[PDB]
Symmetry: C3
Subunit: 56 residues, 3 copies
């Protein structure tokens, strides 16, 4: 398999295409600034610390 990172502005525009995304791809949604990984039969949210202006 192959992989990469796909991006969407809104949770809506994304969930309209999450079906299209192959397993092992990462998914970013700007609305909530969240990151997911596509797995078999679902998706798993990556745990992120809160936004900061500095790389902490």
């Amino acid at each position: 398999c192959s992989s990469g990172v796909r991006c969407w502005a809104t949770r809506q525009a994304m969930l309209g295409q999450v079906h299209e995304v192959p397993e092992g791809w990462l998914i970013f949604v700007a609305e909530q600034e969240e990151l997911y990984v596509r797995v078999q039969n679902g998706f798993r949210k990556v745990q992120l610390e809160a936004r900061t202006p500095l790389p902490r």
Copy 2:
């Protein structure tokens, strides 16, 4: 001028047979275990993931 990416393998043993050739800074996905790692110098950092969402 450094770009990496995400690489995926179906099983952990398939990944281990090829990971010597993965540079530091790449992400590694192992599908069978649904595990995601950052490849670092001679090692791995596991990414913390939440439970599967349908």
Copy 3:
């Protein structure tokens, strides 16, 4: 409708010198302290990583 990716730097100082050219939604790896961030608008969200191990743990 966009695509991103993963960019890497050896040091945090070199990364910050370039981060204005990194769009929101890209991932940033820094070899200094082996950190991984999601680039967000004018900032960062640090990925939660477990401590490095020699074997995928």
